[PDB]
């Protein structure tokens, strides 16, 4: 599977309530913003960290963003997920 295909497959599980916490998501966003490649701009990172919007809505929007942005971005997401949510990372069905 390509990483894009994996992400499409894993999206319903990843976005299920309880799977990722706000703290995990926040750290994933930082991982995708602060380094190289930069997957998320500062403005995008702030949007996805916005405390006023429900976490699930922000996550679904993040998944859509990564899927449209291509293979490299999806690969970086999986690395960020390994770093900040290893238990979940290990349980994903595309594994």
């Amino acid at each position: 599977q390509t990483y894009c295909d994996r992400l499409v497959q894993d999206t319903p599980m990843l976005t299920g309530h309880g799977r990722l916490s706000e703290q995990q998501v926040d750290r994933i966003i930082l991982q995708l913003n602060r380094y190289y490649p930069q997957i998320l701009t500062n403005k995008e990172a702030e949007k996805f960290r916005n405390p006023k919007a429900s976490l699930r809505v922000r996550l679904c929007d993040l998944m859509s963003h990564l899927q449209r942005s291509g293979e490299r971005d999806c690969q970086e997401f999986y690395r960020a997920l390994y770093i900040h949510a290893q238990p979940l990372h290990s349980r994903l069905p595309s594994r």
Side-chain angles (χ1 to χ4, degrees):
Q1 290 182 282
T2 70
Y3 279 103
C4 290
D5 298 317
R6 290 185 62 200
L7 195 58
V8 164
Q9 182 183 353
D10 289 338
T11 285
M13 280 193 64
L14 281 164
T15 60
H17 293 104
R19 293 255 168 70
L20 285 166
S21 70
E22 182 74 50
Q23 293 289 357
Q24 292 170 312
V25 171
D26 296 350
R27 292 173 175 157
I28 289 167
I29 285 162
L30 287 177
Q31 195 65 42
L32 296 172
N33 167 256
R34 290 286 289 189
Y35 309 108
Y36 187 85
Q38 182 177 53
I39 302 310
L40 300 177
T41 65
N42 286 5
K43 85 169 190 295
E44 287 166 343
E46 296 303 332
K47 174 175 70 179
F48 293 126
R49 291 163 71 83
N50 178 5
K52 177 63 181 65
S54 87
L55 180 62
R56 179 157 189 277
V57 166
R58 286 180 280 129
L59 270 175
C60 289
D61 289 348
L62 178 60
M63 301 302 107
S64 296
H65 178 107
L66 296 165
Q67 294 164 13
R68 77 173 59 96
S69 296
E71 185 71 357
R72 187 72 176 190
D73 290 26
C74 293
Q75 180 170 14
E76 296 297 333
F77 172 78
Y78 278 94
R79 175 161 166 271
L81 191 73
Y82 165 75
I83 296 169
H84 297 297
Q86 194 273 329
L88 178 59
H89 180 273
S90 68
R91 292 171 70 218
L92 293 180
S94 71
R95 175 97 34 231

Short mmCIF file of all heavy atoms in Angstrom, two decimals, residues 13-64:
data_model
loop_
_atom_site.label_atom_id
_atom_site.label_comp_id
_atom_site.label_asym_id
_atom_site.label_seq_id
_atom_site.Cartn_x
_atom_site.Cartn_y
_atom_site.Cartn_z
N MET A 13 -10.67 4.52 11.91
CA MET A 13 -10.17 4.14 13.22
C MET A 13 -9.46 5.30 13.92
O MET A 13 -9.70 5.56 15.09
CB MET A 13 -9.25 2.93 13.11
CG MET A 13 -10.03 1.63 13.00
SD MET A 13 -8.92 0.06 13.26
CE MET A 13 -8.42 0.38 15.11
N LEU A 14 -8.57 5.99 13.20
CA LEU A 14 -7.81 7.12 13.76
C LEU A 14 -8.70 8.20 14.33
O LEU A 14 -8.34 8.85 15.32
CB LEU A 14 -6.91 7.75 12.67
CG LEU A 14 -5.61 7.02 12.34
CD1 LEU A 14 -5.07 7.54 11.02
CD2 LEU A 14 -4.61 7.28 13.44
N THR A 15 -9.84 8.42 13.69
CA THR A 15 -10.74 9.52 14.06
C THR A 15 -11.83 9.07 15.04
O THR A 15 -12.63 9.87 15.48
CB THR A 15 -11.38 10.17 12.83
OG1 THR A 15 -12.15 9.20 12.10
CG2 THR A 15 -10.31 10.78 11.91
N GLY A 16 -11.85 7.80 15.40
CA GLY A 16 -12.83 7.34 16.37
C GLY A 16 -12.61 7.98 17.72
O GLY A 16 -11.47 8.16 18.15
N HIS A 17 -13.69 8.32 18.42
CA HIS A 17 -13.54 8.97 19.71
C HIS A 17 -12.73 8.12 20.66
O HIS A 17 -12.95 6.91 20.74
CB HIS A 17 -14.90 9.23 20.34
CG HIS A 17 -15.71 10.23 19.60
ND1 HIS A 17 -16.77 9.88 18.79
CD2 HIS A 17 -15.60 11.58 19.51
CE1 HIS A 17 -17.30 10.97 18.27
NE2 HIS A 17 -16.61 12.01 18.69
N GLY A 18 -11.79 8.76 21.35
CA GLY A 18 -10.94 8.10 22.32
C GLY A 18 -9.62 7.60 21.75
O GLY A 18 -8.70 7.29 22.48
N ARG A 19 -9.47 7.56 20.44
CA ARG A 19 -8.25 6.98 19.88
C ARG A 19 -7.04 7.90 20.05
O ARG A 19 -5.96 7.43 20.41
CB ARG A 19 -8.52 6.57 18.45
CG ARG A 19 -9.56 5.37 18.41
CD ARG A 19 -8.84 4.17 18.11
NE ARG A 19 -9.60 2.94 18.29
CZ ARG A 19 -10.61 2.53 17.54
NH1 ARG A 19 -11.13 3.28 16.58
NH2 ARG A 19 -11.12 1.33 17.79
N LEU A 20 -7.23 9.19 19.80
CA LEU A 20 -6.19 10.17 19.99
C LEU A 20 -6.69 11.23 20.95
O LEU A 20 -7.83 11.70 20.86
CB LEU A 20 -5.80 10.82 18.66
CG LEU A 20 -4.94 9.95 17.75
CD1 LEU A 20 -4.91 10.53 16.35
CD2 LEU A 20 -3.54 9.84 18.32
N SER A 21 -5.83 11.60 21.89
CA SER A 21 -6.13 12.69 22.80
C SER A 21 -5.70 14.03 22.24
O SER A 21 -4.89 14.09 21.32
CB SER A 21 -5.43 12.49 24.13
OG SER A 21 -4.04 12.67 23.96
N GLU A 22 -6.19 15.10 22.85
CA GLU A 22 -5.78 16.43 22.44
C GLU A 22 -4.27 16.58 22.54
O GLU A 22 -3.64 17.14 21.64
CB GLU A 22 -6.49 17.50 23.28
CG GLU A 22 -6.14 18.92 22.88
CD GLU A 22 -6.80 19.33 21.59
OE1 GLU A 22 -8.02 19.12 21.46
OE2 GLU A 22 -6.10 19.86 20.68
N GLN A 23 -3.68 16.11 23.64
CA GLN A 23 -2.23 16.25 23.78
C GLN A 23 -1.50 15.49 22.69
O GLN A 23 -0.51 15.99 22.18
CB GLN A 23 -1.76 15.79 25.16
CG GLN A 23 -2.23 16.68 26.30
CD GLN A 23 -1.54 18.06 26.33
OE1 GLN A 23 -0.66 18.34 25.53
NE2 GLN A 23 -1.95 18.91 27.27
N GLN A 24 -1.95 14.29 22.34
CA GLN A 24 -1.26 13.56 21.27
C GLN A 24 -1.38 14.29 19.95
O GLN A 24 -0.41 14.41 19.21
CB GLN A 24 -1.82 12.13 21.15
CG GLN A 24 -1.49 11.22 22.33
CD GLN A 24 -2.26 9.92 22.27
OE1 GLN A 24 -3.46 9.90 22.04
NE2 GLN A 24 -1.56 8.81 22.45
N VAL A 25 -2.58 14.75 19.63
CA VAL A 25 -2.78 15.45 18.38
C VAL A 25 -1.93 16.72 18.34
O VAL A 25 -1.33 17.07 17.32
CB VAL A 25 -4.28 15.77 18.16
CG1 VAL A 25 -4.47 16.69 16.95
CG2 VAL A 25 -5.05 14.44 18.01
N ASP A 26 -1.89 17.44 19.46
CA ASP A 26 -1.12 18.67 19.49
C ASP A 26 0.35 18.40 19.20
O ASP A 26 0.99 19.17 18.46
CB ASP A 26 -1.28 19.36 20.84
CG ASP A 26 -2.69 19.81 21.10
OD1 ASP A 26 -3.55 19.77 20.16
OD2 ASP A 26 -2.94 20.19 22.26
N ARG A 27 0.89 17.32 19.76
CA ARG A 27 2.29 17.00 19.53
C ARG A 27 2.54 16.53 18.10
O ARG A 27 3.59 16.81 17.54
CB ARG A 27 2.76 15.94 20.51
CG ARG A 27 2.81 16.48 21.91
CD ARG A 27 3.11 15.41 22.89
NE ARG A 27 3.28 15.96 24.22
CZ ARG A 27 3.13 15.28 25.34
NH1 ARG A 27 2.77 14.00 25.33
NH2 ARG A 27 3.32 15.88 26.50
N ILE A 28 1.58 15.80 17.52
CA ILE A 28 1.68 15.39 16.13
C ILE A 28 1.71 16.63 15.22
O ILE A 28 2.51 16.69 14.29
CB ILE A 28 0.50 14.47 15.78
CG1 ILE A 28 0.71 13.11 16.48
CG2 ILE A 28 0.39 14.27 14.29
CD1 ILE A 28 -0.51 12.20 16.48
N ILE A 29 0.85 17.59 15.50
CA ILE A 29 0.81 18.81 14.71
C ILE A 29 2.15 19.53 14.79
O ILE A 29 2.70 20.00 13.78
CB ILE A 29 -0.33 19.70 15.16
CG1 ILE A 29 -1.64 19.12 14.64
CG2 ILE A 29 -0.16 21.14 14.66
CD1 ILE A 29 -2.83 19.64 15.36
N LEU A 30 2.72 19.60 15.99
CA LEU A 30 4.02 20.23 16.15
C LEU A 30 5.11 19.51 15.37
O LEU A 30 5.94 20.13 14.73
CB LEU A 30 4.38 20.36 17.61
CG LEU A 30 3.53 21.45 18.26
CD1 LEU A 30 3.86 21.51 19.72
CD2 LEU A 30 3.77 22.79 17.60
N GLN A 31 5.07 18.19 15.40
CA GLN A 31 6.01 17.38 14.64
C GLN A 31 5.93 17.69 13.14
O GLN A 31 6.94 17.73 12.45
CB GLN A 31 5.71 15.91 14.87
CG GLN A 31 6.80 15.00 14.43
CD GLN A 31 8.03 15.23 15.27
OE1 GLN A 31 7.95 15.38 16.50
NE2 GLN A 31 9.15 15.29 14.63
N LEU A 32 4.71 17.92 12.66
CA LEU A 32 4.49 18.21 11.25
C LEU A 32 4.75 19.68 10.89
O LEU A 32 4.74 20.04 9.71
CB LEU A 32 3.06 17.85 10.88
CG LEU A 32 2.68 16.39 11.01
CD1 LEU A 32 1.17 16.21 10.79
CD2 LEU A 32 3.51 15.56 10.01
N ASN A 33 4.98 20.53 11.89
CA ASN A 33 5.18 21.96 11.67
C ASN A 33 6.61 22.44 11.87
O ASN A 33 7.08 23.32 11.15
CB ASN A 33 4.25 22.75 12.60
CG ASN A 33 4.59 24.22 12.67
OD1 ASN A 33 5.17 24.67 13.64
ND2 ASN A 33 4.22 24.97 11.65
N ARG A 34 7.31 21.84 12.82
CA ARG A 34 8.56 22.43 13.31
C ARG A 34 9.83 21.98 12.63
O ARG A 34 10.90 22.57 12.89
CB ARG A 34 8.69 22.18 14.81
CG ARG A 34 7.73 22.96 15.65
CD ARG A 34 8.10 24.42 15.74
NE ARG A 34 9.29 24.59 16.57
CZ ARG A 34 9.75 25.78 16.96
NH1 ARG A 34 9.15 26.89 16.56
NH2 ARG A 34 10.80 25.86 17.74
N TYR A 35 9.83 21.03 11.81
CA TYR A 35 10.97 20.38 11.24
C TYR A 35 10.97 20.38 9.69
O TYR A 35 10.45 21.29 9.08
CB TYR A 35 11.10 18.98 11.91
CG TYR A 35 11.07 19.05 13.40
CD1 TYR A 35 10.02 18.63 14.10
CD2 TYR A 35 12.08 19.61 14.12
CE1 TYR A 35 9.97 18.74 15.45
CE2 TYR A 35 12.03 19.71 15.46
CZ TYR A 35 11.00 19.28 16.13
OH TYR A 35 10.95 19.43 17.46
N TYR A 36 11.70 19.40 9.10
CA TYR A 36 11.80 19.33 7.65
C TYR A 36 11.56 17.89 7.20
O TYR A 36 12.22 16.98 7.66
CB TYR A 36 13.18 19.80 7.16
CG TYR A 36 13.24 19.88 5.65
CD1 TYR A 36 12.79 21.01 4.99
CD2 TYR A 36 13.67 18.80 4.89
CE1 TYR A 36 12.78 21.07 3.61
CE2 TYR A 36 13.66 18.87 3.51
CZ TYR A 36 13.22 20.01 2.88
OH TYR A 36 13.21 20.07 1.50
N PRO A 37 10.63 17.68 6.27
CA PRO A 37 9.83 18.69 5.60
C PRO A 37 8.82 19.29 6.55
O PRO A 37 8.41 18.69 7.53
CB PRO A 37 9.12 17.91 4.50
CG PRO A 37 9.04 16.53 5.02
CD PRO A 37 10.32 16.32 5.78
N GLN A 38 8.43 20.51 6.25
CA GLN A 38 7.33 21.14 6.95
C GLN A 38 6.03 20.80 6.24
O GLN A 38 5.77 21.23 5.12
CB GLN A 38 7.52 22.64 6.99
CG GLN A 38 6.42 23.35 7.75
CD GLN A 38 6.65 24.84 7.86
OE1 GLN A 38 6.87 25.54 6.86
NE2 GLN A 38 6.62 25.35 9.08
N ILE A 39 5.22 19.99 6.90
CA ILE A 39 3.96 19.53 6.33
C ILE A 39 2.85 20.54 6.59
O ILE A 39 1.97 20.74 5.74
CB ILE A 39 3.62 18.17 6.91
CG1 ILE A 39 4.75 17.17 6.61
CG2 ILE A 39 2.28 17.67 6.40
CD1 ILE A 39 5.19 17.14 5.18
N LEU A 40 2.89 21.19 7.75
CA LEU A 40 1.89 22.18 8.15
C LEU A 40 2.53 23.52 8.41
O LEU A 40 3.49 23.62 9.19
CB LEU A 40 1.16 21.73 9.40
CG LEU A 40 0.38 20.42 9.33
CD1 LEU A 40 -0.21 20.11 10.71
CD2 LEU A 40 -0.70 20.47 8.27
N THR A 41 1.99 24.56 7.78
CA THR A 41 2.44 25.91 8.06
C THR A 41 2.03 26.31 9.47
O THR A 41 1.22 25.64 10.10
CB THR A 41 1.80 26.90 7.08
OG1 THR A 41 0.39 26.93 7.31
CG2 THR A 41 2.09 26.52 5.64
N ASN A 42 2.56 27.42 9.98
CA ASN A 42 2.15 27.90 11.28
C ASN A 42 0.65 28.17 11.34
O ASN A 42 0.01 27.82 12.32
CB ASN A 42 2.91 29.18 11.66
CG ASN A 42 4.35 28.91 12.04
OD1 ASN A 42 4.85 27.79 11.94
ND2 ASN A 42 5.02 29.96 12.46
N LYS A 43 0.09 28.78 10.30
CA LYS A 43 -1.35 29.04 10.32
C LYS A 43 -2.17 27.75 10.31
O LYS A 43 -3.17 27.63 11.01
CB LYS A 43 -1.77 29.97 9.17
CG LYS A 43 -2.05 29.28 7.85
CD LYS A 43 -2.71 30.24 6.87
CE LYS A 43 -3.23 29.52 5.63
NZ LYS A 43 -2.13 28.93 4.82
N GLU A 44 -1.72 26.77 9.53
CA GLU A 44 -2.42 25.47 9.50
C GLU A 44 -2.31 24.78 10.85
O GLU A 44 -3.28 24.18 11.34
CB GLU A 44 -1.85 24.58 8.41
CG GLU A 44 -2.28 25.04 7.03
CD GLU A 44 -1.51 24.41 5.91
OE1 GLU A 44 -0.42 23.84 6.14
OE2 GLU A 44 -2.00 24.52 4.76
N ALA A 45 -1.13 24.80 11.45
CA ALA A 45 -0.97 24.21 12.76
C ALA A 45 -1.92 24.85 13.78
O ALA A 45 -2.49 24.15 14.61
CB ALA A 45 0.47 24.35 13.24
N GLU A 46 -2.08 26.16 13.74
CA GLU A 46 -2.94 26.82 14.70
C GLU A 46 -4.39 26.42 14.47
O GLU A 46 -5.13 26.21 15.41
CB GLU A 46 -2.78 28.35 14.64
CG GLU A 46 -1.39 28.85 15.03
CD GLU A 46 -0.93 28.43 16.41
OE1 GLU A 46 -1.76 28.20 17.33
OE2 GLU A 46 0.31 28.35 16.59
N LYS A 47 -4.79 26.31 13.21
CA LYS A 47 -6.13 25.85 12.87
C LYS A 47 -6.40 24.45 13.45
O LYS A 47 -7.45 24.21 14.06
CB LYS A 47 -6.29 25.83 11.35
CG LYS A 47 -7.59 25.22 10.85
CD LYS A 47 -7.71 25.36 9.35
CE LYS A 47 -6.72 24.46 8.63
NZ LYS A 47 -6.82 24.56 7.15
N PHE A 48 -5.46 23.53 13.26
CA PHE A 48 -5.68 22.17 13.74
C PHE A 48 -5.54 22.00 15.26
O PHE A 48 -5.95 20.98 15.80
CB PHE A 48 -4.78 21.21 12.98
CG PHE A 48 -5.15 21.08 11.52
CD1 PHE A 48 -4.22 21.28 10.53
CD2 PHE A 48 -6.44 20.75 11.13
CE1 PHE A 48 -4.56 21.14 9.18
CE2 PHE A 48 -6.78 20.64 9.81
CZ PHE A 48 -5.84 20.83 8.84
N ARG A 49 -4.98 23.00 15.94
CA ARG A 49 -4.83 23.02 17.40
C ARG A 49 -5.92 23.89 18.06
O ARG A 49 -5.92 24.04 19.28
CB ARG A 49 -3.43 23.56 17.79
CG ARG A 49 -2.24 22.65 17.47
CD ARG A 49 -0.90 23.44 17.51
NE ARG A 49 -0.52 23.80 18.87
CZ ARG A 49 0.12 22.99 19.70
NH1 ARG A 49 0.45 21.76 19.32
NH2 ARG A 49 0.42 23.40 20.93
N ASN A 50 -6.81 24.46 17.26
CA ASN A 50 -7.79 25.43 17.76
C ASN A 50 -8.69 24.81 18.82
O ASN A 50 -9.48 23.91 18.52
CB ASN A 50 -8.62 25.96 16.59
CG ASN A 50 -9.69 26.92 17.03
OD1 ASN A 50 -9.77 27.28 18.19
ND2 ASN A 50 -10.54 27.32 16.11
N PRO A 51 -8.58 25.30 20.06
CA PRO A 51 -9.36 24.65 21.12
C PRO A 51 -10.88 24.83 20.97
O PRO A 51 -11.61 24.10 21.61
CB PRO A 51 -8.88 25.37 22.39
CG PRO A 51 -7.59 25.95 22.06
CD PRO A 51 -7.65 26.30 20.60
N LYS A 52 -11.32 25.77 20.14
CA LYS A 52 -12.75 26.04 20.00
C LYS A 52 -13.49 25.00 19.14
O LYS A 52 -14.70 24.86 19.23
CB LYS A 52 -12.96 27.45 19.42
CG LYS A 52 -14.42 27.82 19.17
CD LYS A 52 -15.21 27.84 20.47
CE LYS A 52 -16.68 28.18 20.22
NZ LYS A 52 -17.37 27.13 19.42
N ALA A 53 -12.76 24.26 18.31
CA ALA A 53 -13.37 23.27 17.40
C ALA A 53 -13.20 21.87 17.98
O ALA A 53 -12.16 21.59 18.57
CB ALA A 53 -12.70 23.35 16.04
N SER A 54 -14.18 20.98 17.78
CA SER A 54 -14.07 19.63 18.33
C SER A 54 -12.86 18.90 17.75
O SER A 54 -12.52 19.04 16.57
CB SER A 54 -15.32 18.78 18.09
OG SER A 54 -15.27 18.13 16.84
N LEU A 55 -12.20 18.13 18.60
CA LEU A 55 -11.01 17.40 18.21
C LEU A 55 -11.28 16.49 17.01
O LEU A 55 -10.48 16.44 16.08
CB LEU A 55 -10.46 16.63 19.40
CG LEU A 55 -9.21 15.83 19.09
CD1 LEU A 55 -8.08 16.73 18.68
CD2 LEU A 55 -8.84 15.04 20.33
N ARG A 56 -12.42 15.79 17.01
CA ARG A 56 -12.69 14.86 15.91
C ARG A 56 -12.82 15.61 14.57
O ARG A 56 -12.34 15.13 13.53
CB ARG A 56 -13.93 14.01 16.17
CG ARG A 56 -14.27 13.03 15.05
CD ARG A 56 -15.13 11.85 15.54
NE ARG A 56 -15.28 10.80 14.52
CZ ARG A 56 -16.17 10.83 13.54
NH1 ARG A 56 -17.01 11.86 13.42
NH2 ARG A 56 -16.23 9.83 12.66
N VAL A 57 -13.46 16.78 14.59
CA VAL A 57 -13.62 17.57 13.38
C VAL A 57 -12.25 18.01 12.88
O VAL A 57 -11.95 17.88 11.68
CB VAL A 57 -14.55 18.78 13.62
CG1 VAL A 57 -14.46 19.80 12.46
CG2 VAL A 57 -15.97 18.29 13.80
N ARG A 58 -11.40 18.52 13.78
CA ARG A 58 -10.05 18.92 13.40
C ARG A 58 -9.27 17.72 12.86
O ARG A 58 -8.56 17.86 11.87
CB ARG A 58 -9.35 19.56 14.59
CG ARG A 58 -9.86 20.95 14.87
CD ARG A 58 -9.16 21.57 16.04
NE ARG A 58 -9.66 21.13 17.34
CZ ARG A 58 -8.93 20.66 18.34
NH1 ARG A 58 -7.63 20.46 18.21
NH2 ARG A 58 -9.53 20.37 19.50
N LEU A 59 -9.41 16.56 13.47
CA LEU A 59 -8.67 15.38 12.99
C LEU A 59 -9.13 14.96 11.61
O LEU A 59 -8.33 14.63 10.76
CB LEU A 59 -8.81 14.20 13.93
CG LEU A 59 -7.79 14.09 15.02
CD1 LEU A 59 -8.20 12.93 15.90
CD2 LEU A 59 -6.40 13.88 14.41
N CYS A 60 -10.44 14.93 11.40
CA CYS A 60 -10.95 14.56 10.09
C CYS A 60 -10.45 15.55 9.05
O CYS A 60 -10.12 15.16 7.93
CB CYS A 60 -12.48 14.53 10.10
SG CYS A 60 -13.22 13.15 11.03
N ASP A 61 -10.42 16.83 9.40
CA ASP A 61 -9.92 17.83 8.46
C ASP A 61 -8.42 17.65 8.21
O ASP A 61 -7.96 17.82 7.10
CB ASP A 61 -10.22 19.26 8.95
CG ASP A 61 -11.68 19.60 8.86
OD1 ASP A 61 -12.45 18.85 8.21
OD2 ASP A 61 -12.06 20.63 9.45
N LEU A 62 -7.67 17.27 9.24
CA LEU A 62 -6.25 16.99 9.06
C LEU A 62 -6.07 15.80 8.12
O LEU A 62 -5.22 15.82 7.23
CB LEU A 62 -5.58 16.73 10.41
CG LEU A 62 -4.09 16.38 10.32
CD1 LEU A 62 -3.27 17.46 9.69
CD2 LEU A 62 -3.55 16.04 11.71
N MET A 63 -6.86 14.75 8.32
CA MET A 63 -6.75 13.60 7.43
C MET A 63 -7.03 13.98 5.99
O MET A 63 -6.32 13.55 5.10
CB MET A 63 -7.70 12.48 7.84
CG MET A 63 -7.49 11.96 9.24
SD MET A 63 -5.68 11.26 9.55
CE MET A 63 -5.02 12.71 10.65
N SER A 64 -8.06 14.80 5.76
CA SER A 64 -8.37 15.23 4.41
C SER A 64 -7.22 16.03 3.83
O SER A 64 -6.89 15.89 2.66
CB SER A 64 -9.64 16.06 4.40
OG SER A 64 -10.75 15.29 4.81
#
